[PDB]
RNA sequence: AAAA
RNA sequence: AAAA
RNA sequence: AAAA
RNA sequence: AAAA
RNA sequence: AAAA
RNA sequence: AAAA
């Protein structure tokens, strides 16, 4: 899923660290316009993250972007998830005009907001991620660089809410995993270059095949079988990883 | 699994379509010595196909490989199954010498043979394949090309004997699939060039992932889900189809 | 893709160091008219680099060049990328006339701008290059001169956004790699004279063949194979470089 | 791979059309001594084609050439493939002395020979080529002069036994292609003069680059991409052809 | 009826054997322009025979000649019957351009074609003959030589489609018979020189008189009467025969 | 390419050194009328150099020469390259008459000019040469007297913009190398008398053969091969310079 | 390369026509002592042509000449290639003494000979030429006079063995061209007087320059470029043509 | 080809 | 096919 | 997660 | 990046 | 720049 | 300037 970030340069320190966590969760992100990038792809285009702040409300350039984003959001094209860097009590709603104050209160009440505090990074990163996948189909977890039996792996774990998906789910799923694979060790991507990957979590066989297939000539692939709770090697690109090796995970 | 064919030139006509049927079942066939390539690969080398015939045993060139193949069959390196072109009743065991007759009788009784007759090709071909797959892992029925919902498609049907597989089975398997995909339409191969291929049959997630993965950049891949019983598209290498469409049965 | 540079002589110090970085990215640069050079080649003509600055906006000759460039930009022949030498806040908008101020603000709001700061060289150059390639097909990284296994090399890294290209992409691609090869050691060009050139980045076979073909009798060519992740020599022009060694990277 | 032809003048008519077909398979042929030409090049020197016939073994001069060829074949530097112009049944074994008969019988059994019959040209020529390529790296089908979408070109299709090649394969290879390109229309060579050349078959990126590179300033180059199963033009050395046009295969 | 044969020299062997069979059916044939020879005779001009083949469509001379044949075929001057040397599926339609392929497909569907197979000569030749006579008046089976009661004789078998013919049909007929009578024994013609001819088949009185009359001073004439089913001699040019003898069937 | 120099006698000091530098670049220079000499040779006559200066505009003889030169420049016979001795801001257009000032301003604006500064001579000379070659085919660099391995050479280096020339380029190229060879050591010519020359830069073989050919019995000719990046001797007129010696340059 | 002809007067008719063919192939031939002419020039001296015949070996003067030729052939100064006017089968070995017979058999076996026949001149001349060039550098096909586009012209076709030549190859070459240019129309020489000469065949730049240069003031020179495949005129010594005209193939 |  |  |  |  |  |  794509994600457009609206923010001021003052909170630039914290947006990417939030964005990086989202990036590690196989979520497409776009920073730099955004209004015309909304009308692109499928109706499941992106979820707007309005990083509300005292400074952000003081910028007219940043304000009108929220107006156009919300105006077309009523059409159902996009959904907005506003993030409060400061708690609900201390927004400067007095400084803003009556039209702006009414506009902010309408979207703050009828639409759910996510509170953010820099002190507790762990829960805050979970809350934004939870709201991101709350209205979406099968979710993903941030990839974990773990070592099992002396072998380095990056496990890709996904969770299916309700344990049921539409049979034609892949038709409307805009998740192309090739864009998340690093082409070089120094390149920043969710999936490390040449590092073997592992698939985790319950799911139908067609979902596993769909994720496994684009990894040919890119990464060694492991899969998880709950019959023996062990990892199974199905692709051999790295040296020494024969197809069929078992890792007691 | 590899297969080496022992036969005479007179019975050649019977060999090829037997080999052709075996090739369609994803069985590697080597028709044209034979002894030295038996010592190659893994302990699961091949099955010696001795096309026993009334004339086959009348050639001194044809007798020895049966001896050497049997000689190393005692070592367990290979297993031999005899193809009886004619019935056991009218085999001319009188023609052979005493040593040859007893040797032929020793291998015919202690080792199971399979009867073959030109008249009923469908049963005879099935018995030969059964004699091939009886002591093997997950089976492989011949590739059948079917048009479902107006979409042409070929099915790779696999069935597991028993109910479970060793967790490390893929390590010792010798069914690398790259050698069964045609590169040009005119060239013959078990898998047609550019024709979408569907995987059908119950099995573990890793076995499906192992099969579909080498098909990237080669063929459109379909997969069967038993929850609703249609075919699911995972790879789109052909125009007019996308990953996620369904072919109702 | 070629690039046209419209700037004032005071910003000459920053323009060339910007220009050379673009040149190292396999981008054709034309510094020194420009209005008539716009109408040349393919519809993907060039990106107008308007280095807006406080000194830039007080030159009437510089203003009329921008006016015609934007006038044709409405026709879609050439798009403009305005790069700000100074940040928008300190731009001297009061000095200019009403029509010019409205004109400058019109292109500053509807069309995306990129900011430049002398302090942050690395991020400033990357932002300008990113603005160049965002609307472009397969992009190019700046050429890096590295030594692998004691052998001098230069790597031409290219990344394809979306991992998909039109079948007839080479038809409309205005990149002639011959013009970027130095004919003498002292000549300044993206590709060093007689230095081996390595090709890096995933891509189709035709893209690889098209890129390394013009290098015959000019440079020895290396290519990257991700199956074992190390460069392969395919052309031999220098002494001691047989075609076929592997350089572990 | 080099090829030396040992034959008698009576069987000459058969040799040329065998040599011509082998030449079309990008095989270096040397008809007219031979023993000293064996000591040349790499350990993969050549294959000795002994065109055995009833007339051939009556010549003392032809016999010593076979003697020295087999004597140094024991070192493994060259391997011999004996082509039987006549079937083994009516080979005049009584004519030769005891030493010659024992020698000829020794090399016919332990070494694989091929049968040649004047009636079945298509099967005989393929079998001889099959023995040539059976112990070899990537194959080379004879150049096919085809016409697609109104344009005429010669295709060069190659098959890779197995699926993978050694990383340093090109170092030991001896298939310098520039010797197979005709310089004049009347010149008879595997590659026609100025005729477009197409490469077909799945393989690594470096293999394709190594093949198209010597074709600069010689012929236009086409490559086959399996994503859309179409030929792609990379080089345009002739009018009416542009680099990047696509032919529907 | 006249007929022109359009073919290339590669298929010349099959055209002549088709040619002579049509000649025995009393069909005027012209092998070797053809376009201006179309405008000759009566509105029932002739039938065009386009010997389509994979090699036939690769000649521009054949194509342009075919186009003019179809161009004035629309005017109704001539009707074309395309005889396929190879089966329709094996037609190399990819080689032709868009215009040529569309033109060939237009005439293959809207206009009935005839399929030829060299394996089944007798049925293939009849289909060409059947396509020839399907839109024609009274038919003409090939001349057969039958020795009846020890007397050699040739039969000109004719049958009338339907049951009746126009009263003035003879006015527009193009089957003058003096051009099919051999003048010397060595010279080849549908009617043998000096051999008695016989007319067989139901028909009107004038049809028998019209055919019999040109045979005066040329050959002995026999007429078949269905009242008692023998042959009646009406003209005696050979010794030993008189007008009035009967040949019992 | 030819050229006439229009200047006042006060600028004679700087004109000759500019003329000498252009002469070193294989440019035919004519200093001392100029109007009637314009109509001579081919359509690519020359580029007119107007050495504009404050004193130059004060001469009626110089002014009327410029008028006729520009008047016939409109027909396209020759194009004018205006070289400004002083900067544009310092030109004295006030004392100049109205009609001439409009004439001067029309030329300066619609046609590109080159600035001249005696301080930065290296950039000044190159800028004039750049505009001199800017609208021309393959350009020529100033001759460099280089000693390589103790051997004196005068390298003639040429650059081809776009690496492609019309096949009949030599037909309309007005460059005769004979006139640039010094007949005596004291003669002032671009090519030194009896000093060996070298050809540098990529180009077609016929271009090389065209250049070295008129040097027979005049100078020893060296050529540069990029296969080993070494100079090759092809002519031996000087003592001790055999044809074939290699100079590692 | 130089050539010496050792022959008997009875075979003079066949010898001078062999010399004529060799002369046409740019081979300098001296027919009429020879032993002292062996020691002249470079180590690549000349190839001895011993026209062996039944009459030739019956002359003591011819026999002693061959012995000295073979005496210094062991020293490597000159290599001998023998022409068999008659076949080896019916050579009269019984005439020679034991020493002569053994000596002749010594050179017939360890040294490759060329069989010549009166009937098939075309192959016989080619075989003699092939032996001359087999151990040589860049070949030289016989000069052919071909008219292109109404212009008379002669072609000097040369081909390089393998693909590359030593960088200093020109130093040791003994193929000065001025000795093969006719000075008068009646005089016989490989290169006709005043007829334009064309150079054809792939090769390095210096090779073309070395061949082209000595033709100044002698003949018009055409150069073949493979980019577009025509001949390019570089020197104009004949009226009616200029440097730059093209001769379309 | 016996008025073609 | 005995005025088809 | 052994056709979810 | 082993026909993307 | 080894038929640009 | 070695048939300019």
Residue numbers in the entry:
A (entry chain H), B (entry chain G), C (entry chain F), D (entry chain E), E (entry chain Q), F (entry chain B), ...: 2 to 33, 42 to 258
The authors write:
Here we investigated a protein containing a CARF domain fused Toll/interleukin-1 receptor (TIR) domain, Cat1. We found that Cat1 provides immunity by cleaving and depleting NAD+ molecules from the infected host, inducing a growth arrest that prevents viral propagation. Cat1 forms dimers that stack upon each other to generate long filaments that are maintained by bound cOA ligands, with stacked TIR domains forming the NAD+ cleavage catalytic sites. Further, Cat1 filaments assemble into unique trigonal and pentagonal networks that enhance NAD+ degradation.
The cryo-EM structure of cA4-bound Cat1 shows that the complex assembles into filamentous structures, forming intricate higher-order networks. The fundamental repeat unit of this topology is defined by the two-fold symmetric alignment of a pair of TIR-CARF monomers, involving central positioning of the CARF domains and outwards positioning of the TIR domains. Successive stacking of TIR-CARF dimers, anchored in place by bound cA4 positioned between them, results in formation of linear filaments, exhibiting a slight twist, as part of the higher-order filament network. While analyzing the higher-order filament network of cA4-Cat1 complex, we noticed that the dimeric repeat units associate with two adjacent Cat1 dimers forming a surprising trigonal assembly. The inter-repeat unit association is mediated by amino acid backbone interactions between a small loop formed by N158 and G159 residues joining the β1- β2 strands of the CARF domain (designated β1β2-loop) of repeat unit 1 and the N103 and A104 residues present at the TIR domain of the adjacent Cat1 dimer. In this trigonal assembly, the third Cat1 dimer does not pair up with the first Cat1 dimer, but instead it tilts around the center of the dimer (see blue arrow implying a shift below the plane). The tilt causes a shift of the TIR domain, one of which points towards the trigonal assembly, below the plane of repeat units 1 and 2 by 24 Å, thereby forming the helical bundle by bringing it close to the CARF domain β1β2-loop of the Cat1 dimeric unit which initiates the next turn. Thus, the trigonal Cat1 dimer assembly gives rise to a spiral filament bundle with a triangular pore in the middle. Three Cat1 dimers are present in each turn of the spiral bundle with an overall diameter of 170 Å and the bundle is closely packed without any pitch (gap between turns). To test the importance of these supra-structures for Cat1 activity, we made deletions of residues N103-A104 and N158 to eliminate the backbone interactions that facilitate high-order assembly.
